[PDB]
Design a protein around this ligand. Structure first.
Ligand SMILES: [Mg+2]
Ligand SMILES: [Mg+2]
Ligand SMILES: [Mg+2]
Lengths: 204, 203
């Protein structure tokens, strides 16, 4: 789902690219300080979620007023007259593009770095730990190598971009992936936890 | 539920009392070598479960031929003509009594010693580990003391015996709820235990 943006367990998280700065301020608020041509900030997107309703604040900054900032630097001061959007289609396409860049950075890149469930010594690999990331990706930490299963396209490759391999181990990744997805979706039936580290089976 | 007897994760568990020897041979088979007057074995119950069907074999051993054996000793050889029961009501009351003694020993005493879910550093006690036992009992291992919540009567006590409460009694029930909801939630697992875990934000 593209709306609202999911920021659960993603607080404190930042990313800096050539396109600007992406900051998840709270589990209910993230930010996109868009860097423009000439490295000045002309637009700041604020995305805030109250339970199930989401508000997107689009601040417009006059040119040559504020420069694109690096990661741990202070948040740029916001304007007092931002455009306000309460639903996706209300946003114009030119603003919608900047919104896509932010939610992608949060749901794909950032969520891919954050471990949600980690399983130590599965019966599938009693010699390592299997990590299911926030974006659904599976990461199996081996000595000096990582077996990666991408949630988006189902691809499988071993790493040090990297690649690749397959054969016998590729069959092995799917049950632990299924186990953990089964563990997560089942643990998604938890009452209104994550992140979790566990061991199961033997011995033990 | 008294039938069938639940023996999951209880293989290997044995108990020796004055009433006889109680042995869980497999997760689908348990055993009660009943001690008789004169410390001889006159009756052996075998309880076996195939998925959901349970068969109870009641062996009758002639008096004064075989003595009650101690723990980890060889299983007494069975007879070739045991009474066979496929349901609870089929059993006569004297066999039913011996059956109750076995299922109690397995579901209460033995199950109370086996940890099923253990949670390290819950937010309610980030300094200990909480264990949910097979019989539903909660055991919280503290430094030099154990907080016990009995599943049957809801009683709460520390550690001889001895009992406490007041402040701290409030702390035990949510973790119990947390773990029971964790257990019952993990009961929706596909066709795991036992499990040790840490959760949240101390890690
Ligand atoms: Mg370990
Ligand atoms: Mg620890
Ligand atoms: Mg501990």
């Amino acid at each position: 789902q593209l709306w609202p943006i999911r920021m659960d367990r993603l607080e404190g998280q930042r990313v800096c690219t050539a396109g600007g700065r992406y900051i998840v301020e709270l589990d209910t608020r993230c930010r996109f300080e868009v860097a423009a041509q000439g490295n000045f900030v002309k637009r700041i997107l604020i995305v805030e979620v109250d339970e199930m309703v989401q508000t997107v604040y689009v601040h417009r900054i006059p040119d040559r007023t504020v420069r694109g900032r690096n990661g741990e630097e202070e948040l740029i001061t916001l304007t007092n007259n931002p455009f306000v959007y309460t639903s996706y289609s209300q946003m114009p396409k030119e603003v919608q593009n900047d919104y896509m860049r932010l939610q992608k950075m949060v749901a794909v890149t950032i969520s891919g770095r954050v471990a949600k469930v980690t399983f130590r010594r599965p019966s599938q690999f009693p010699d390592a730990q299997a990590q299911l990331m926030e974006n659904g990706d599976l990461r199996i930490k081996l000595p000096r190598s990582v077996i990666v299963r991408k949630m988006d396209n189902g691809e499988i490759f071993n790493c040090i971009q990297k690649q690749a391999v397959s054969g016998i181990t590729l069959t092995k990744v799917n049950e632990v992936y299924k186990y953990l997805i089964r563990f997560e979706q089942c643990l998604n039936g938890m009452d209104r936890c994550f992140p979790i580290v566990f061991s199961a089976g033997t011995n033990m």
